[PDB]
Symmetry: C4
Subunit: 332 residues, 4 copies
């Protein structure tokens, strides 16, 4: 594999069509799914030259701990759909690569099993109808050693997945929600923040004033995201709001972004627009589908090489230097 | 049907080619027909998160009465071209869905028959050569219980419909103007406004100063519209003028928009740009062609679900909240 | 024929490929040829409604005389390439339509023969190496009753016509320059202006300061033009400079535009951007090729209908009103 | 050959696929390779008319000596890949055309042999791990009569050439680095500047502040360049930074540009955006592949004719006049 696109081709070959569609699809007309890629392709970096690259490092510190790359594995539900080892294969490879892994509320292996793999597990929360049950799930994650609560805030309900409707897609009997819903509000965020000392990261923020309110609410971070184009069809790409959100946040929390990251150059673009780190979703599942744990390892090694390559070519010895790069929008 | 595009495919299958072309076509090179869709596809919404969605409602009040959605059926002439029940099938489904139905001056069933279906009938006026006859038509509509006069102001004459010319299209002998023309001016508007206590809504306004003059003239509303691309070829899309017109009108009348609405997300976009409500034309006829009254019912149920979905995903419990959403233009 | 594009198809059928290429082609990569069309397609008009259209007229006054439309036939050399009657067929149809006809320096029928057709003949000048010969040609045109001298200023030499080079195209022995070259300068303009009381119109101006200098030099008009994409490849379209040039000229001369006019709507766009009138080149030759004099008559009747249609749909009873229309750029 | 694109077709016919790919390819997704062409195609020139063209000249003075065109042959490694005479064929043709030739550090014929051809040889430096060896290479070039040191500053290492990886491309045994690496820094630039009285030209500058620092560092020139899209994938095109860099440099050094020059019109565009001169890479190798020395001669004669044509059509008797042209961005 010499690009993440190689892995997409390999996963399309192996997966059943309706499972590939569950993974690849977005909501509605897929306008936001496509725009996530359009937006990154319009960004060009202005690289710097002639800087010291003696000790180029892609490492970052986030939520108190070192990560090997400015990247984490996005929460993607039901990973046993893609490979029999599911979440355990992905979490093992992430651990070995030094990348945080976000455990899903709708994981097909229990959160305690996945946390026992080790590494840096985060936990993605969906709000349950029942504050008490929601908080018990947060407490389970904390007791199991997860380091952050990634509270998904853009799913009052699931978007309209027209591929799934047309395919009549349903979970196989052999895939279940191994950890076993209502719209979340700012009151739900406060209940979580009061229940845990872990950093609470709000995933799915796109409006500048919601990013400011997230800091005011005590969030340790946000993920600027349109949920990979799977929720509101026509939601702006996170990448297009990132710069304005980073300016409004004034360092008050970590600002991550996701949606459409398909290379180390895309990581560099996100960093140059001000992201602390990115999440990567579909490509990790492609690698899982194509070759299990070893596939995910290869993907993360390829992404690490691409990130190091892009940083050094752009004159950046550290991720902080990359955040100080300027960019210019082009036409594609 | 899981999208309005499903219905377009179904109507193309059933209708004779020249009737599909009469419905689908625009004037000239169809630049404005295409631009109506281009414009909506360039708009992206910035959704809000974590708001109370306990009681999401798509209802609005307009011209004194409640409507179930921020939408009405646009005036489309000669609906018996598309289905034997024509206007009665559409008006029955609109009534049952809680959506106003605009009766045409060139309806193929008389306006009194269509008004007798019930619901919320509006009446679309074309100016007749003869003030007295024009006003008698307004009086008929009022006597029959129509709630608003939608005065079409962008047809001094019909545009150049090159599909119709190339097809040699003419009305079948079995379709007639069952209610049975000169360019309208501001004097014509004043004559209508003085003749009726119903709100007069000027349909086909695109210039900001014409929107201001409409308020000064006593209009209760305007429809920002290029007539679905069927009149001036190269007229700007209504959606591209809507924000500037809403700012200039300062709440002085209702501001509707039409042209290219093909989903509940498109309704959300129009609302976010400031529209009070939208009109929907061609998709309603697709549903009529495909399956008569039941087809139109299914279309309106699908649109209601899409509007509720898009509003809630965007953090909006009411249409007023949706009007306060911000937007960002993209590239497609 | 219901559009000018119908005539293009008819002319491609009848003409020999290398003559169609001589007519259709531009210089170099044809970037400016394509951009002339791209530019018009990006312009959208903001029409006005509810204005008095009792007496819509497409007439203009230019260089002291009435024309039936805001249009003249552009200078196109060697019209016998396209039809045996060549320039006489075109000039007869232009006369009958009330449209000025620009006689070429490189006409395949003598300028005195073409002027004898009547109508409103203008004369397009190329500067000869020899001031005295150039001025004698101007004097011939004046003696023959031409009403304006259209001095082409964008041909210090012919551009690189790669279609012609690849085709090995040369004039047939039966086509000659029936009136029988050096780069023109501002001194050449002054020599012409001093030699004739006819208005001198500089054709091929694109820079704002050249338009200002043209007024200072005593020009009666300019044609904002990149020579139909046939001279500098990569020259900006005239339509993209027109508004800035009209503002800089402050009414000091007539400002015409050409390049890519393919409909009455395009005429309206040019007028709305501030042009006094347009020139039309290739479409007139298409009509000549397809059907001789009668073809050109049909073209001009079609253009007259399209111009009247577009003006009235846009609320304009006169060309002056059309010049006061606003426009908005779109994406196509 | 009537365009540079003719030569590209001829070279694709003759070269082995993997050598054509080595020549044509870029890094990563080739976003910057494509954008180099997109950027030039978006630029339109505003030509001037009616200026004296008695003595049009394409000559420039650069680094103290006259060149026949505002162009030099870019450094392209291993030219024996394309033709058995390699660098000697290209340098002979460049000499005969009056164009400087940049000798590569990775030339397949020794720099002393190529300099002995005569003409105006420049020398492109890659920094060696070893200041002393780097400076000895600079001294060899100077001793052999090279006139400028073109220090490539955008290669801390080679970019990711996915065509080469997929092809398994390697140098044939019969091609070697006949002159026989570490990241360069500003200290490396100072070591070169102190070692030679030749002008030092930094190639691969894209950031405005790096251009300013280059002047402060004593560079005699810079090449605004993304290395033909072969280094950072997603680096901005040089052409898009050129105007801002020329303004920041305030005449303090020569400002060249490269990437995607495919015609004399493209040379004119670069000049109008403020470049002192351009470099041309791939087209020179196409000509070498297609027909050896004579091919390169034909290419340079064609480019000279296109540059003279474009300059005169744009009203420019000198390259300095062309630099004073204005431009307008379009859509393509
Ligand atoms: C099949 C699939 C399931 C989920 C389930 C979840 C989820 O239960 N909770 C959550 O909070 N986000 C999810 N997501 C979004 C994900 O976390 C990233 O937001 C996007 O995948 C980023 O875009 P890509 O890198 O995929 O372009 C999903 C994405 C995909 C493709
Ligand atoms: C076949 C057809 C006939 C009519 C006849 C009329 C009419 O006698 N009076 C009027 O005032 N508007 C009309 N219209 C325009 C309509 O009311 C809406 O302006 C557009 O259909 C909105 O765009 P879509 O939703 O169709 O894109 C028509 C639209 C179509 C397609
Ligand atoms: C075959 C052909 C010959 C000539 C010869 C001349 C000419 O001897 N003198 C002149 O001054 N302009 C010319 N022109 C340009 C013309 O006058 C108009 O500038 C463009 O045709 C406007 O663009 P279209 O309407 O064609 O798009 C020509 C255009 C075409 C196509
Ligand atoms: C096969 C190939 C090898 C080299 C090797 C070098 C090099 O050892 N040192 C250097 O400093 N630049 C190089 N370059 C870049 C070149 O000098 C110009 O920057 C681009 O070719 C300009 O773009 P095009 O004119 O090609 O679009 C190369 C370009 C090509 C195509
Ligand atoms: O991504 C999916 O569809 C899932 O299976 C989990 C889920 C469910 C509803 C909304 C978002 C994610
Ligand atoms: O839409 C049409 O073509 C109609 O049948 C009614 C009509 C007629 C003329 C202009 C606008 C609408
Ligand atoms: O258009 C042409 O090519 C002609 O035949 C006349 C001409 C010649 C040179 C430049 C412009 C027009
Ligand atoms: O262009 C190439 O790939 C070369 O052969 C020389 C080279 C090597 C590494 C970076 C830039 C140029
Ligand atoms: Mg991503
Ligand atoms: Mg609509
Ligand atoms: Mg024209
Ligand atoms: Mg180049």
């Amino acid at each position: 594999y010499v690009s993440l696109a190689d892995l997409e081709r390999a996963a399309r070959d192996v997966l059943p069509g309706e499972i590939f569609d569950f993974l690849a699809g977005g909501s509605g007309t897929e306008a936001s799914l496509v725009a996530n890629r359009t937006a990154l392709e319009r960004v060009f970096v202005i690289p710097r030259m002639l800087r010291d690259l003696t000790d180029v490092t892609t490492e970052i510190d986030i939520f108190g701990r070192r990560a090997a790359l400015p990247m984490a594995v996005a929460p993607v539900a039901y990973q046993r759909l893609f490979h029999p080892e599911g979440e355990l294969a992905v979490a093992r490879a992430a651990r070995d690569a030094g990348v945080p892994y976000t455990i899903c509320t709708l994981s097909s292996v229990s959160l305690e099993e996945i946390a026992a793999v080790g590494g840096r597990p985060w936990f993605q929360l969906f709000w349950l109808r029942d504050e008490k049950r929601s908080l018990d799930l947060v407490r389970r994650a904390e007791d199991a050693g997860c380091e952050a609560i990634v509270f998904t805030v853009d799913v009052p309900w699931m978007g309209r997945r027209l591929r799934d409707m047309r395919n009549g897609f349903a979970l196989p009997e052999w895939v279940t929600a191994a950890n076993f819903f209502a719209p979340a509000t700012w009151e739900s965020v406060e209940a979580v923040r009061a229940h845990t000392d872990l950093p609470v990261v709000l995933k799915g923020i796109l409006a500048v004033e919601d990013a400011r309110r997230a800091v005011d609410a005590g969030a340790g971070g946000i993920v600027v995201s349109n949920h990979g184009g799977r929720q509101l069809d026509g939601a702006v790409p996170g990448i297009e709001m990132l710069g304005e959100i980073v300016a409004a946040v004034s360092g008050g929390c970590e600002v991550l972004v996701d949606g459409g990251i398909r290379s180390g150059g895309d990581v560099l673009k996100a960093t140059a627009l001000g992201a602390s780190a990115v999440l990567v979703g579909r490509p990790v599942m492609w690698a899982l589908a194509a070759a299990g744990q070893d596939g995910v390892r290869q993907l993360l090694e390829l992404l690490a090489e691409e990130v190091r390559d892009a940083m050094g070519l752009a004159g950046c010895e550290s991720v902080g230097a990359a955040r100080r790069l300027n960019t210019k929008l082009g036409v594609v």
